[PDB]
From a paper:
The SARS-CoV-2 spike glycoprotein is the major surface antigen of the virus. Its function is to bind the host receptor ACE2 and mediate the subsequent membrane fusion required for cell entry. Here we have examined the structures and receptor-binding properties of spikes of the B.1.1.7 variant first described in Kent, United Kingdom (now termed Alpha)10,16–19 and the B.1.351 variant first described in South Africa (now termed Beta). Recently emerging variants of SARS-CoV-2 have acquired other substitutions in the spike including a number located at the monomer-monomer interfaces, at the receptor-binding site, and near the furin-cleavage site.
In addition our structures of unbound, uncleaved Alpha spike suggest the trimeric state of the receptor-bound form of the Alpha variant spike might be further stabilised by the substitutions D1118H and A570D on the inter-monomer interfaces, as also recently suggested by Yang et al.. Two recent studies showed increased RBD erectability and enhanced receptor binding by the Alpha and Beta spikes. Spikes of both variants have the same mutation, N501Y, in the receptor-binding domains. This substitution confers tighter ACE2 binding, dependent on the common earlier substitution, D614G.
Residue numbers in the entry:
A (entry chain A): 566 to 620, 641 to 676, 689 to 713
B (entry chain B): 714 to 828, 855 to 940, 944 to 1146
C (entry chain A): 961 to 1146
The structure:
């Protein structure tokens, strides 16, 4: 059996004569988030293309970040992990992983007869 | 001289960024083999340069998007009271029912384009929801403040007065707006309706990019079933049929072919990324000059005299809806450069001298509204034997009747 | 990277040419020589392509710098966010190693004040529109002021121009106009 790009994705075993598929084992690159070797020596590894089922474990859309706590607040983006997530060292001290905030929530007092 | 006007809204499509892609140099060439990798080490560092170039392009895409869209300090919000003097920004402003918080036209645009062996695809730093949030902030700031929010703190102002000051910057006076507010509101609403009706029946600028980025990958993948002169285009087949003394004259041909394929791909991607970067710079300039202000440059923000623009977000691109002002119906008149009243020559201050056949009036250039020629519309300069086409009508002098 | 590419075999028996020429008899050294030639040509042909692309990018940036020098320094520009954020006044160039530094001086407003505003004044049936400014009010009286700095003045016949009658404008208020000629006429 083949696929769009001529790669064997199915096969029939000679003895039992049953249909089996083939799926490549999980791959992916490794990226490390560091706050600079002048402040601290901690890091946070992030497998890019694998879920956490495989090898403080937050599963993200961009991969499976390991070694960084997850917070609820929202700050500016220091280290752009991806898909709206950013990581920073400033929380005794630990690396956090939050969601990026675009800015303050403002609202002008618009009306039909007021000017500033 | 025109007697009537129309408001026209036109769209403009611009690509901003393309899909990020990182291609492994070792897994693409070899795979899981080890003899292939040991042979590949003899070529030096041709697997670090390619990865560095691809990472550079990947970072540049996010920089493009960030510099185009992130131009507002604070996320402004539209007030609930939608009394804008008749103008209806309902298909432009977001609808807080869909989970994506996207307006009608942004949905029409997002449903028009859409419908490992080394290669991966990385996710964008700014997800589509955040881009919609940015465009909504820009729209709410433009509507409720004008150009003030792009040049410091935001100052409120009623929309009708803002449009009056937008007319006053293209020559037409503001009583023209205030005395024809309903007609202008109706024309603007009709124009928005036509835009939404024409976006549902295109977007070739944003598709000729996806097509090229897809055929490049298709060619790269298809360049893996070529023999390149060896006996078979499978490393796991060669390694299972030849002893190591006599397989490194075959794997070497495979290595040469696959390296040349990767080099061609990387060069083409570098050139394409440069082109996209130029377009993103143009898009950022258009945003800064047409949205956060009113532009006097001709044919930059649309076709006609620019009034204002609104941004919308499209997949891997941006959409501008330029609002302009075009004169409609003209009429023939007769003109004189100056008037010789009493040995003096009266030139118009801001306007032009026209006559319908019997009497002479003074009127503004971009609209027709005649006025009597007083001494508050004209100024004197010399005698009337130098000007070439001077006529000899009379003026009003509005102080004489009151001095009785 | 280009320099370090000189210490790779590229398939030959060594990465140094003198060893190739000394250890081997001419007719069988040309194979090693050709392998080295191919490798080094590939290296020095990738370097030139990357350099050309970088040069084009730098050329675009230099063109932008020339335009900014021409339009922000030698004059005052109305293009928004081109010569800095805010309303532009002037700029000064400074030389830096392989670059330029512009110092953009800009006007930017400050502490605000909310007001009550109307688009016209109906004096005696006629409708008066501001000549150059905007109508404002502090609660009781009405003034006309410029749009970028609070500086109220008494509404007069010189600050306004007449147009039609006060029946078609949507929002309109009643007030008076000074008519400065009258006190001197008597
Ligand atoms: C400016 O005034 C607005 C409301 O205007 C009021 O009525 C006018 C007719 C005029 O007489 C003004 O002097 C009056 O104040 C107010 O806007 C509020 O600002 C506060 C700031 O904390 C905000 O919490 C409220 O939500 C605003 N009101 C609304 C309806 O949204 C305020 O007094 C002044 N605002 C600004 C921006 O200067
Ligand atoms: C200027 O043009 C507008 C439309 O472009 C005219 O408004 C129309 O007037 C007719 C007759 O009064 C109405 O039947 C229409 O409903 C109006 N609106 C439209 C959209 O057609 C307007 O009359 C023109 N001005 C003058 C002075 O004739
Ligand atoms: C040109 O326009 C002027 C003003 O619109 C016309 O002058 C008017 O003519 C009528 C006819 O008797 C008079 O009652 C008015 O007093 C005149 N002035 C104004 C301000 O209306 C003139 O008739 C027009 N000429 C042509 C050939 O159409
Ligand atoms: C609003 O402006 C008016 C116009 O100046 C002010 O009215 C005058 O204010 C001066 C200065 O205090 C007094 O000397 C006059 O007697 C005022 N005239 C009248 C008729 O009241 C007014 O005080 C300002 N403030 C308010 C709240 O109205
Ligand atoms: C400005 O908007 C106000 C609403 O805040 C308008 O007032 C409305 O309409 C009439 C006129 O006074 C009144 O019933 C109320 O003040 C408002 N109605 C309701 C149902 O709230 C006012 O007409 C507008 N004025 C201008 C000049 O635009
Ligand atoms: C031999 O292979 C056949 C399939 O061709 C299978 O049906 C059979 O059971 C096998 N023999 C034994 C002893 O299992
Ligand atoms: C490290 O940081 C401290 C202050 O945070 C600073 O004084 C010092 O120069 C830095 N050193 C390096 C090598 O960055
Ligand atoms: C990883 O595991 C989670 C949990 O079952 C699953 O939802 C997710 O789809 C898995 N990842 C992939 C790529 O299938
Ligand atoms: C943080 O968020 C999680 C889920 O979003 C919630 O269960 C938890 O209580 C929150 N903690 C704080 C301190 O807000
Ligand atoms: C704006 O248009 C929508 C549909 O086009 C309509 O439902 C709504 O009532 C309109 N609002 C105003 C104020 O005209
Ligand atoms: C002006 O006059 C010319 C020649 O008489 C004519 O062709 C033209 O149509 C006239 N303009 C208008 C607006 O009727
Ligand atoms: C235009 O030309 C005609 C005839 O050629 C002439 O009578 C008239 O004076 C000219 N108009 C000017 C010079 O303003
Ligand atoms: C206009 O009329 C005056 C009347 O005093 C006359 O002297 C002058 O020549 C006239 N101009 C032309 C161009 O005929
Ligand atoms: C202005 O005065 C006229 C005449 O007395 C009156 O009819 C009108 O209602 C006044 N304006 C307002 C807004 O009340």
């Amino acid at each position: 059996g083949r696929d769009i790009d001529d790669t064997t994705d199915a096969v029939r075993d000679p003895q039992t004569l049953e249909i089996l598929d083939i799926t490549p084992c999980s791959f992916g690159g490794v990226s490390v988030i560091t706050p600079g070797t002048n402040t601290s020596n901690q890091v946070a590894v992030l497998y890019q293309g694998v879920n956490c089922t495989e090898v403080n474990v937050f599963q993200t859309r961009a991969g499976c970040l390991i070694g960084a706590e997850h917070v609820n607040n929202s700050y500016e983006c220091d280290i752009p992990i991806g898909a709206g997530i950013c990581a920073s060292y400033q929380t005794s001290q630990s690396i956090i992983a939050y969601t990026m905030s675009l800015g303050a929530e403002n609202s002008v007092a618009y009306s039909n007869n007021s000017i500033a | 001289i025109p007697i009537n006007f129309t408001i026209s809204v036109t769209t403009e499509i611009l690509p901003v960024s393309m899909t990020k892609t990182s291609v492994d140099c070792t897994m693409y060439i070899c795979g899981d083999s080890t003899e292939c990798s040991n042979l590949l080490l003899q070529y030096g560092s041709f697997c670090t340069q390619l990865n560095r170039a691809l990472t550079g392009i990947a970072v540049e895409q996010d920089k493009n998007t960030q510099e185009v869209f992130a131009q507002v300090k604070q996320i402004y919000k539209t007030p609930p009271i939608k009394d804008f003097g008749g103008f209806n920004f309902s298909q432009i402003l977001p609808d807080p029912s869909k989970p994506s918080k996207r307006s009608f036209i942004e949905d029409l645009l997002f449903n028009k384009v859409t419908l490992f062996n080394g290669l991966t695809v990385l996710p964008p730093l700014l997800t589509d929801e955040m881009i919609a949030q940015y465009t909504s902030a820009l729209l709410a700031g433009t509507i409720t403040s004008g150009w003030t929010f792009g040049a410091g703190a935001a100052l409120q102002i009623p929309f009708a007065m803002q449009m009056a000051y937008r007319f006053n910057g293209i020559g037409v006076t503001q009583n023209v707006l205030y005395e024809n507010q309903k007609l202008i509101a109706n024309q603007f609403n009709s124009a928005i309706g036509k835009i939404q009706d024409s976006l549902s029946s295109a977007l070739g600028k944003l598709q000729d990019v996806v097509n090229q980025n897809a055929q490049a990958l298709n060619t790269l993948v298809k360049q893996l079933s070529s023999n390149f002169g060896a006996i078979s285009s499978v490393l796991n087949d060669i390694l299972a049929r030849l002893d190591p003394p006599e397989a490194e004259v075959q794997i070497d041909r495979l290595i040469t072919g696959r390296l040349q394929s990767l080099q061609t791909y990387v060069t083409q991607q570098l050139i394409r990324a440069a082109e996209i970067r130029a377009s993103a710079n143009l898009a950022a300039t258009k945003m800064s000059e047409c949205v956060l202000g009113q532009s006097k440059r001709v044919d930059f923000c649309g076709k006609g005299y620019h009034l204002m623009s609104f941004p919308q977000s499209a997949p891997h691109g941006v959409v501008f809806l330029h609002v302009t002002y075009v004169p409609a119906q003209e009429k023939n008149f007769t003109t004189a450069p100056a008037i010789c009243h009493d040995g003096k020559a009266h030139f118009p201050r801001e306007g032009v001298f026209v006559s319908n056949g019997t009497h002479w009036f003074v009127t503004q250039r971009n609209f027709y509204e005649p006025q009597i020629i007083t001494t508050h519309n004209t100024f004197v300069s010399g005698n009337c034997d130098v000007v070439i086409g001077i006529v000899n009508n009379t003026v009003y002098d509005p102080l004489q009747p009151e001095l009785d």
